Homo-oligomer: A and B are copies of this chain.
């Protein structure tokens, strides 16, 4: 069934993300702990498709975030398009802990590490693999299709970017709604 993001699911996920941040020695304030965003992308299977996000700062000039991912959690394929005169978000990912499998346009990598549910494979169209372990980075230019899945222990991945406007992101999966609906 097309399941639902509940308050209890959100609380459970927020607490798990906080433990992961603490394990990686990343200090976060009590106020920030309350502002960790939990999204299941409107797909109803948070532990399959989902992200736990801390926004450190986001303004017209720049943005920085911490993306926390549970084991094998997937961020559905999307891109950050131009918005009016804004070029669109460019971002640099830096893995801080665990490992993540990032996919961008290019020649399909053989034997990719990511495992996508069979019924959703149609909504993953780019297959050039970049594996990031702690300390490693990759930069995604604006309006570029990408998606990612954490490894079997999960991941913490920093974002450094231009202004973020999540509401304007374009997803390949037409079922995705970026902004959560918590019951």
Q: Report which A residues bind B (CB closer than 8 A).
A: 24-29, 32, 56-57, 59, 61-64, 87, 90, 92, 94-97, 134-137, 139, 158, 160-162
Contact partners of A162 in chain B: CB under 8 A: 61-62
Contact present for B27 and A135 (CB under 8 Å): yes
Q: A27-B95, A61-B161 are in contact. List 14 more A-B contacts (CB 8 A).
A: A25-B26, A27-B97, A27-B135, A29-B136, A32-B135, A56-B92, A56-B137, A57-B139, A57-B160, A61-B162, A62-B92, A62-B160, A62-B162, A64-B158
Q: Within the complex, what minimum Cβ distance (angstroms) separates A60 from chain B?
A: 9
Contact present for B135 and A57 (CB under 8 Å): no
Contact partners of A90 in chain B: CB under 8 A: 59, 61-62
Interface centre among A64, A87, A90, A134 (most CB of B within 10 A): A64
Contact partners of A136 in chain B: CB under 8 A: 29
